[PDB]
Amino acid sequence: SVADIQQLKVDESDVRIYFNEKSSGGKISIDNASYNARKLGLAPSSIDEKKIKELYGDNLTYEQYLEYLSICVHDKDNVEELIKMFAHFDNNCTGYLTKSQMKNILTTWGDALTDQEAIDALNAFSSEDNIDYKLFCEDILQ
């Protein structure tokens, strides 16, 4: 209600239908809410999930889920912040990180991916060992 529901960029019919696909007893789990956010093209982190859990627990009513989705819009996101994070690790200044170097970063810190998730994501992007991380960040943001 106080949330930015109007602004939520997403087809509202999909928002509802995705909720009905995953809801049980009128509520949707956080895991399924984040899944739906992703299907709608939003990118929640653990910070977003923690915020909504702190407010409402593990199972959200429809209204609460709408509020969760509005938390997930991340208008501030840009490619520069993503590139700069990887550039931290590019100490020899090549413009590339290997798949192993990328796998290590993505699986060791933050909202760590599993080895298989990282590997699958990197393999989906490129068949070569050297990854242009600028192009990778451009790809994931869209």
């Binding site: 899944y35 299907k39 990118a43 653990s46 993503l82 990887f86 933050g110 991916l113 998730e117 994501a121």
Partner: peptide
Amino acid sequence: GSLLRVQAHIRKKMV
């Protein structure tokens, strides 16, 4: 920080 945004967009893409 940034890292989380990177991981978030990868999870989005792989869905």
